[PDB]
Amino acid sequence: MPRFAANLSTMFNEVPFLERFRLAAEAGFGGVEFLFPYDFDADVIARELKQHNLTQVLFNMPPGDWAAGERGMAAISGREQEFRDNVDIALHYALALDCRTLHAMSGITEGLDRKACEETFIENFRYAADKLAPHGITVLVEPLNTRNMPGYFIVHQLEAVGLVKRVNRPNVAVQLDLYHAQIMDGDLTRLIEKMNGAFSHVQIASVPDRHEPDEGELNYPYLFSVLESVGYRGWVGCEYNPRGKTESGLAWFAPYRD
C-alpha cells in the first residue's frame, strides 16, 4: 500500500496552519507536506512534527515575491545569487524538520529566451544538488499545467526528465503530480513506467476539479497499484482542495490510515 502525506497548505484549512498537524495525525496520516514554512519558526514546526508523530515529506524552497505573482526563480537568468541564498534558507528548515526532499520552483518564464532559462535552471539545480548532497537531501522539479499556471517554465513530464539528465546530479529528480500529468500529458500508466526511477515524490488530486482522489476522470486505486508495481516506495502527497470539510472527505483514505 502507498503511504500518504496530508498537504497542510490545501487540507485542514478549517483551522489555522499550526493546528493542522494535530488534525492530520488524528485522521491517521503519518506524513505531511506543505508549500512554505518560512513565515514560521523552524523550531516550532519541528516540535509540531515531534509532538504529533509526523514525518515532513516535502516543502518548497522560497519562491520570491509570491504576492507580486512570482512562482520561483530557478529558471530566471540574473537571479542566481538570490536562488543560492534561498537554498541556505531552505536547508536550515530541511535540517530542522529532518526533511529529505525539497521542491525548487522555476518561475514564470514566458517572454524570456528559452535557452537562457534552461541554462540557468541547470546551473541553479546543480548548485542546489551540490549543497544538499552532504545532507542526503534531494531537490525536485515539478511540472505544472498551463491552465492553473500559465507561462510556467516546465509543464511536461518527460521534458522535465530530460532537463534532469542535463543537470547530471544523482540527488535531483522529478516531482510527479498526477493531477498536472493528466491535464498536460495523459497516458499515465505507461508514463509512470517510462519514468520509473526518475520521480522521488508523487502528488494526487481529482481531475478536473482538484478534490479528493475518489471522483473524476482518473481511477486512483488503479494508479496506486501501478506505483506499487514499479517499486515506488516514496510518499504520495494529498495536494487537493477538499470538496467540503476535510475529514468528511476521507473515506477514500480509510484503507490506508495509520
d(CA 233, CA 158): 21
Q: Whose Cβ is closer to Mn ion: residue 148's or residue 189's?
A: 148
CB of 216 to Mn ion, least distance (A): 16
Q: Among residues 142, 193, 217, 247, which one is catalytic?
A: 142
119 is catalytic: no
d(CA 41, CA 44): 5
| Residue entry with cell 552532504 | 134
CB of 176 to Mn ion, least distance (A): 9
142 is catalytic: yes
CB of 137 to Mn ion, least distance (A): 19
CB of 142 to Mn ion, least distance (A): 6
Tell me which residues touch Mn ion (CB under 5 A): 177, 203, 239
Helix (H/G/I), strand (E/B), else coil: 226: helix
| 201 within 8 A of 237, measured Cβ to Cβ | yes
Q: And the C-alpha cell for 211? A: 478534490
List binding-site positions: 142, 177, 203, 239
Q: Which residue is nearest to Mn ion (CB)?
A: 177
Q: Whose Cβ is closer to Mn ion: residue 127's or residue 181's?
A: 181
Helix (H/G/I), strand (E/B), else coil: 159: helix
With b for 16 or more beta-carbon neighbours within 10 A and e for fewer, the 162-181 pattern comes to ebbeebebebbbbbbbbbbb
| 217 within 8 A of 189, measured Cβ to Cβ | no
Q: Whose Cβ is closer to Mn ion: residue 24's or residue 205's?
A: 205
Q: Whose Cβ is closer to Mn ion: residue 99's or residue 127's?
A: 99
List binding-site positions for Mn(2+): 142, 177, 203, 239
d(CA 171, CA 101): 9
The residues annotated with a catalytic role in the active site are 142, 239
